[PDB]
Ligand binder design. Structure first.
Ligand SMILES: C/C=C(/C)C(=O)O[C@H]1C(C)=C2[C@H]([C@@H]1OC(=O)CCCCCCC)[C@@](C)(OC(C)=O)C[C@H](OC(=O)CCC)[C@@]1(O)[C@H]2OC(=O)[C@@]1(C)O
Ligand SMILES: CC(=O)C1=C(O)N2[C@@H](C1=O)[C@@H]1c3c[nH]c4cccc(c34)C[C@@H]1C2(C)C
Length: 994
């Protein structure tokens, strides 16, 4: 295991004492394999076994409803009254709901694809090595590859480990490093040491990274690291070391879970404490085990009254219909709970290229030297029209079309852009528009050369297929490109060594053609081209050039600029060695500046507006970009991250500037920063940590395994649809169209969805408060059992379950994106809303109890004993207050219960309407604003008749409440809940909140 791309090929061999020709000996292999382990990432042990479910049952509010399932089964055996076989469905239904909420609850197929898993895809099964025990090329399990052993790689091979290149057997080695970046265009390798101990992967020109694959050639190298110690394995570990917090809702539901369990077993002691009657009253009779069955009866009644069963199903359905909706709008949300955290997003860090912009480069402006007289110099400047890749548009001067070949320097400008170029252009016959073949910046030039028709080639008589590369071809006819010196970040340029195709125009020797970032290229220009003449570089000249470059890059029209120059008399062909990449810069020396091109990658049509939408939503937007700081700040102005003229010093940092900052100062930079330029390997991940340190819900965009730890880390990882397999799985959302506005649009959707959830979560539990407050009263201060569990199970699944789902379809609030993001710790119910629900639960608690008790005092048709005082006695062993009459069964009658259910169903219908809004009256924000709710109100009441009339069903429940006088009291006991809430709903006029 070496730490060196920075060492000579000798040094690495000597490190492990291997011979390049023999490789590692069988003993070395053994020694090494023990020191370093196998070439593999650890196995993941959280697999698909039933552990899923036994966990699902491990929860409190599941265990509590399971203990009450066992109690229900023991009770469904010992029976009196009519000894009917139908009451066996009672302990059977809970078990079914405990299964249905488990199966659907344990839906970790959405989480079956975890990002660390996806990382095995890039370790191959096979690798080839040159051990000492065979002179041949043993092809072994990649697993058994050790650091120090001499490896072989050829075209098509996935690189088996992090390898220090030793010898390139083919004329050139190209590797595809997309898994890292996403940046398809393959890179050239070399053998020379990269002497900076802290070189980033991009710049490790002599290394092959495990999991990467070879595009062209054959090379022999020495394995340096394996297992978790390769680049890819280091990314694995960071991902393993980050743990996900639970979504702020999931957290509340657990907190509500715990606090419910507390209230449940705080009533059980109160019931016992209120029942110091049985402990002193019933002298004898064997009621010690016959009366302890009564507490077990109210137990299962207390549980189901509190547990808001089916809420799982409601929230799950609501979210599932959220995912479908978001997809139509190009936001693919991998994980269901995400649609909530999405709603809370307070910061978006977005890559510029292809997300904030279109990634469609076109050259707009270009200049060359006009005249250089002493200390004054003028330039010739030109615009170019049309932003597409079509060779369709014009060069113009002073806003008027001109002919580029009339300018000697434009000729050479075009020569360089066509020769110093690895791309080209292709007319897609099928779609009917042209196409880049390669890097976009490079194609922008090809298109340019196509528009400047310097040699005046006839084009209007040409096929739209030939047309594509017509003029470039003419320039290739003119100069034979021998070799080419690749780009490198170290010198920020690229040249091309060219010879004259023996046409004999400018037949004065070979020529290198240099194009690169303006600073470096210009610094290596001793000369300036002026038409065809050449004059020494001077301060005034260099000032003029740089002055305009600065204008174009930082001005309103934001142009990335390339300087182009040529080496008039390049070093001898033989005297150059093309293998020495650090030697490339000195070959590009004694240049003659020729011209500059300024190209644009336009801000996507919708960003300007979307960013404004974020301003209003109180969402920070942070641009991460490869632009130089100057242009970063400019582009930011252009798209409205910064005011057209505002102060921005401390607000935008280069990656280097960030690095110079002490930790604390770095942290403080992130709570303010809106633009990061030329950010490094670590940075995204650091940016996310700091943002989180200020309690910010963070959206972060990225691609590649490079960006996976950041996407894991961020509350919202965001991959591009065109992105790698791994970035995709690491993300919490995929953007199908790569557009920025899809994030912003997905945020609005999440705020919309959550708002209704708040309402339907609150409504559904609001019912349970009532049920408990009811069941308590019908146990302690009174005995006449008002509601039985079975009824409540059907109430909490269907009668409330439909309006609950309908609230899921509530009409989106009108000002969502004009209020700031929701606090994650903001509780759904406290303050005034607690007392509000504390009263509604209480009211209904006294309504269903009151309508069960009213059955005694008033009821005309059917049993009606005025002031019967069922609170007095329930056992019926005496029958002395009742002198002579067979009556002791009206106690467990299927009629006074049908009163309560009819009330409960009806109040929840009003409380469903009540729950359309939080604050606005139903006369301000009407019940007819939600057509699906009315549709549910109808269906809810309709199915209530069904289980009351069609006989099989009113057997497990009760008997029909025929009378209209009986249904009149139902409405007269239930409908005033609208009135109570309404008073409280708008007491907020006084309570100065809204
Ligand atoms: C299911 C029915 C009930 C009555 C249950 O106790 O819910 C309580 C409870 C656990 C909470 C309360 C209920 O508190 C009470 O009702 C007081 C007890 C009075 C009962 C009468 C005595 C016999 C919720 C339901 O209702 C009221 C009346 O305000 C609101 C909210 O719950 C939520 O917001 C859930 C969101 C995930 C929680 O106070 C919550 O505990 C929390 O941690 C919270 C903050 O969440
Ligand atoms: C409010 C609240 O926290 C909860 C809920 O409201 N539900 C779920 C739950 O925990 C429980 C649910 C999740 N997973 C399973 C598996 C099996 C059975 C259940 C569940 C029922 C639980 C219920 C209904 C209490």
């Amino acid at each position: 295991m070496e730490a060196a791309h920075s060492k000579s090929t000798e040094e690495c061999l000597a490190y492990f004492g291997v011979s390049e020709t023999t490789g590692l000996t069988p003993d070395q292999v053994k020694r090494h394999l023990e020191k370093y382990g196998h070439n593999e990432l650890p196995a993941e042990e959280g697999k698909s076994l039933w552990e899923l479910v036994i966990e699902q049952f491990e929860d409190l509010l599941v265990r509590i409803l399971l203990l009450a399932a066992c109690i229900s089964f023991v009770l469904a055996w010992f029976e009196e009254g009519e000894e009917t076989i139908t009451a066996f469905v009672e302990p059977f239904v809970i078990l079914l709901i405990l299964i249905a909420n488990a199966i659907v609850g344990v839906w970790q197929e959405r989480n079956a694809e975890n990002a660390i898993e996806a990382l095995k895809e890039y370790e191959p099964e096979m690798g080839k090595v040159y051990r000492a025990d065979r002179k041949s090329v043993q092809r072994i399990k990649a697993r058994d590859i050790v650091p120090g052993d001499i490896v072989e790689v050829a075209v098509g091979d996935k690189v088996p480990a992090d390898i220090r290149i030793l010898s390139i057997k083919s004329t050139t080695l190209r590797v595809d490093q997309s898994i890292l970046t996403g940046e398809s265009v393959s890179v050239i390798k070399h053998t020379e040491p990269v002497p900076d101990p802290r070189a980033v992967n991009q710049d490790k020109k002599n290394m092959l990274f495990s999991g990467t694959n070879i595009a062209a050639g054959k090379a022999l190298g020495i394995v340096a690291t394996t297992g978790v110690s390769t680049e890819i394995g280091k990314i694995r570990d960071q991902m393993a070391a980050t743990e996900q917090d639970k979504t702020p809702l999931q957290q509340k539901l657990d907190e509500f879970g715990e606090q419910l369990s507390k209230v449940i077993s705080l009533i059980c002691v109160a019931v016992w404490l209120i029942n110091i009657g049985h402990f002193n009253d019933p002298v004898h009779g064997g009621s010690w085990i016959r009366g302890a069955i009564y507490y077990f009866k109210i137990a299962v009644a207390l549980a189901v009254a509190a547990i808001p069963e089916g809420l799982p199903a409601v929230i799950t359905t609501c979210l599932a219909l959220g995912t479908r909706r978001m997809a139509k709008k190009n936001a693919i949300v991998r994980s269901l709970p995400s649609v909530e955290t999405l709603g809370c997003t307070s910061v978006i860090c977005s890559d510029k290229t292809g997300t904030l912009t279109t990634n469609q480069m076109s050259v707009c402006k270009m200049f060359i030297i006009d005249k250089v007289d002493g200390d004054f110099c003028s330039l010739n400047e030109f615009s170019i029209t049309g932003s597409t890749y079509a060779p369709e548009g014009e060069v113009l001067k002073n806003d008027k079309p001109i002919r580029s070949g009339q300018f000697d320097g434009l000729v050479e400008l075009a020569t360089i852009c066509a020769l110093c170029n690895d791309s080209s252009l292709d007319f897609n016959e099928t779609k009917g528009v042209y196409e880049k073949v390669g890097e976009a910046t490079e194609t922008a030039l090809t298109t340019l050369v196509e528009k400047m028709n310097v040699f005046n080639t006839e084009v209007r008589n040409l096929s739209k297929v030939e047309r594509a590369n017509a003029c470039n071809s003419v320039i290739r006819q003119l100069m034979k490109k021998e070799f080419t010196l690749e780009f490198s970040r170290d010198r920020k340029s690229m040249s091309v060594y060219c010879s004259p195709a023996k046409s004999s125009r400018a037949a004065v020797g070979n020529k290198m053609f240099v194009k690169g970032a303006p600073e470096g290229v210009i610094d290596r220009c001793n000369y300036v081209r002026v038409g065809t003449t050449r004059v020494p570089m001077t301060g005034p000249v260099k000032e003029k050039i740089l002055s305009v470059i600065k204008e174009w890059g930082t001005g309103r029209d934001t142009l990335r600029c390339l300087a182009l120059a040529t080496r008039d008399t390049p070093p001898k062909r033989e005297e150059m060695v093309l293998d020495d990449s650090s030697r490339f810069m000195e070959y590009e020396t004694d240049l003659t500046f020729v011209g500059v091109v300024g190209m644009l990658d336009p801000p996507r049509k919708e960003v300007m507006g979307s960013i404004q939408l974020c301003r209003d939503a109180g969402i920070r937007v942070i641009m991460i970009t490869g632009d130089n700081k100057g242009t970063a700040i400019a582009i930011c102005r252009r798209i409205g991250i910064f005011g057209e003229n505002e102060e921005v010093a401390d607000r935008a940092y280069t990656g280097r500037e960030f690095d110079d900052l002490p930790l604390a100062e770095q942290r403080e930079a992130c709570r303010r920063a809106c633009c990061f330029a030329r950010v490094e390997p670590s940075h995204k991940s650091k940016i996310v940590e700091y943002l989180q340190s200020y309690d910010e819900i963070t959206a972060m965009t990225g691609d590649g395994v490079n960006d996976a730890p950041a996407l894991k880390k961020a509350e919202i990882g965001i991959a591009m649809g065109s992105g790698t397999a791994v970035a995709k799985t690491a993300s919490e959302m995929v953007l199908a169209d790569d557009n920025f506005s899809t994030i912003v649009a997905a945020v609005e959707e999440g705020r919309a969805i959550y708002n209704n959830m708040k309402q339907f979560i609150r409504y559904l539990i609001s019912s349970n408060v009532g049920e408990v407050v009811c069941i308590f009263l019908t146990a302690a201060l009174g005995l006449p059992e008002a509601l039985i569990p079975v009824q409540l199970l059907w109430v909490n699944l269907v009668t409330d379950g439909l309006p609950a789902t309908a609230l899921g379809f509530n009409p989106p609030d009108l000002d969502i994106m004009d209020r700031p993001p929701r606090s994650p710790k903001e509780p759904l119910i406290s303050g005034w809303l607690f007392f509000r629900y504390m009263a509604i639960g209480g009211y209904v608690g006294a309504a269903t109890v009151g309508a069960a008790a009213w059955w005694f005092m008033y009821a005309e048709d059917g049993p009606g004993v005025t002031y019967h005082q069922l609170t007095h006695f329930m056992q019926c062993t005496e029958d002395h207050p009742h002198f002579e009459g067979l009556d002791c069964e009206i106690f467990e009658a299927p009629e006074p219960m049908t009163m309560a259910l009819s009330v409960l169903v009806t109040i929840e219908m009003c409380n469903a309407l009540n729950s359309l809004s939080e604050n606005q009256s139903l006369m301000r924000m009407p019940p007819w604003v939600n057509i699906w709710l009315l549709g549910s109100i109808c269906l809810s009441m309709s199915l209530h008749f069904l289980i009351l009339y069609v006989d099989p069903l009113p057997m497990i429940f009760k008997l029909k409440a025929l009378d209209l006088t009986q249904w009149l009291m139902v409405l007269k006991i239930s409908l005033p809940v609208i009135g109570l809430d309404e008073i409280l709903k708008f007491i907020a006029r006084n309570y100065l909140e809204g």
